[PDB]
Amino acid sequence: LYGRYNCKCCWFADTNLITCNDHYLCLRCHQTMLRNSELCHICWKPLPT
């Protein structure tokens, strides 16, 4: 089972979230961390596509 359906970065966005193989990262945080680099910086795993 995954977490409690939260972004895990901002804690306040739970809407059509995306799984990073460990959590429920949201859309904008995912786009920002993908534009930053290739790592995830919150689970240290390759980011999804």
């Binding site: 970065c9 901002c10 804690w11 306040f12 945080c29 920002t32 910086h41």
Partner: protein, 48 residues
């Protein structure tokens, strides 16, 4: 410092765990100042 770290409309919580840890360690800076009763008589009076 608290405002610069906490203020913001939308992009103010990109990494909230780091912000919380930093602010907590900043608030816990009170352990640097020692606790050696600057005055004894005044402290006894206040305790009474």
């Amino acid at each position: 410092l608290f405002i610069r770290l906490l203020s913001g409309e939308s992009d103010a919580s990109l990494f909230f765990s780091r912000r919380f840890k930093y602010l907590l360690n900043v608030s816990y800076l009170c352990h640097l100042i020692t606790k050696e009763t600057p005055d004894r008589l005044t402290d006894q009076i206040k305790c009474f």
